[PDB]
Amino acid sequence: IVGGYTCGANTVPYQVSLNSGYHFCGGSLINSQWVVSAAHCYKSGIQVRLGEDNINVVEGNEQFISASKSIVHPSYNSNTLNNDIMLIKLKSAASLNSRVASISLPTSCASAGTQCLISGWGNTKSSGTSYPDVLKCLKAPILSDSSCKSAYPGQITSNMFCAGYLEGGKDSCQGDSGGPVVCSGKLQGIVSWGSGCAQKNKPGVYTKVCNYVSWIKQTIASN
Numbered sequence: 025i026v027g028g029y030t031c032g033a034n035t036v037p038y039q040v041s042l043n044s045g046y047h048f049c050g051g052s053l054i055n056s057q058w059v060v061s062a063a064h065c066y067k068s069g070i071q072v073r074l075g076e077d078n079i080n081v082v083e084g085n086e087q088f089i090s091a092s093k094s095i096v097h098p099s100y101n102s103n104t105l106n107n108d109i110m111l112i113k114l115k116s117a118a119s120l121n122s123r124v125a126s127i128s129l130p131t132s133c134a135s136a137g138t139q140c141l142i143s144g145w146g147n148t149k150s151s152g153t154s155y156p157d158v159l160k161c162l163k164a165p166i167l168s169d170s171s172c173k174s175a176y177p178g179q180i181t182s183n184m185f186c187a188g189y190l191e192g193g194k195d196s197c198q199g200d201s202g203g204p205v206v207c208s209g210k211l212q213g214i215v216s217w218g219s220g221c222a223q224k225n226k227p228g229v230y231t232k233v234c235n236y237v238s239w240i241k242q243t244i245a246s247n
C-alpha cells in the first residue's frame with residue numbers, strides 16, 4: 025500500500041496473508057472455511073495465515089491453516105485478467121472471534137464515489153520496493169466507469185472497476201494482490217492490477233466481486 029497508514033493490530037479481522045515461506049498475496053475470509061483472493065495468486069503449497077499483523081513475528085492470535093483446494097474461476101484469462109478471482113478452501117475451519125472474522129459478500133454493486141478500505145502487506149514505494157512488517161490501510165473511492173475507461177482504454181471489462189486517486193501518491197501495489205476492498209461492511213473488490221503503483225492518472229483496478237456472488241455461493245455449496 026503506497027500512501028496508506030498502519031491499520032492497527034487486528035483491526036481488519038478478515039484480512040488473510042497467503043504464505044509459501046514468504047507473504048505473496050492477500051485474501052479475505054468470507055466464512056470459517058473459505059477465503060477469496062485473486063486468480064493470479066494461484067500457487068500450490070499455500071498456507072493461509074489469519075489474525076496477522078506483523079507478518080515476521082509470532083505475536084499471538086495467528087492461526088496458520090493449509091489450503092485444501094484452490095479454485096481459480098474457469099474463465100480466468102491471464103492475459104486480460106478478466107475474471108481474476110479464486111476461492112480457497114481451508115483444511116480446517118478457522119476459529120472466529122473478535123480478531124479473526126469473516127466479511128460479508130455484497131448484495132448489490134457499489135456506486136462511483138463510495139469510499140472503501142483497501143489493506144495489505146504489499147510494497148509501500150512507488151519507485152522502489154519497501155515491504156512493511158505490519159498491515160497497511162488506505163481509504164479510497166470507487167471511480168466512475170468513464171474515468172476508469174479513460175485511464176485504461178480497451179482494458180477494462182465489466183468485471184473490473186477503478187478505485188484510488190488520479191493525482192497519484194496513494195494506491196495498492198505489488199504484494200497487495202488478492203486483498204480486500206471493503207465498502208460499507210461488504211467485500212466489493214479484490215486487488216487485481218494497475219500500471220505501476222500510485223502513478224498519476226493510473227488508478228488501481230479491482231475485480232468486481234458483486235458480479236460473482238452467485239458463482240461463489242454455488243461453488244462453495246458444491247465443495
Ligand SMILES: N=C(N)c1ccc(C[C@@H](NC(=O)CNS(=O)(=O)c2ccc3ccccc3c2)C(=O)N2CCCCC2)cc1
Binds near residue numbers: 104105197215
Ligand atoms: N493498484 C496497483 N497499481 C497495483 C495492483 C496490483 C499489482 C500487482 C499486479 N501487477 C501489475 O498490475 C503490474 N503492472 S503492469 O506491469 O502494468 C500489468 C498490468 C496489467 C496486466 C494485465 C495482464 C497481464 C499483465 C499485466 C501487467 C500483479 O501482481 N499481477 C500478476 C501478474 C499479471 C499482472 C498482475 C500492482 C499494482
Ligand SMILES: [Ca+2]
Binds near residue numbers: 077078079081082083
Ligand atoms: Ca505475526
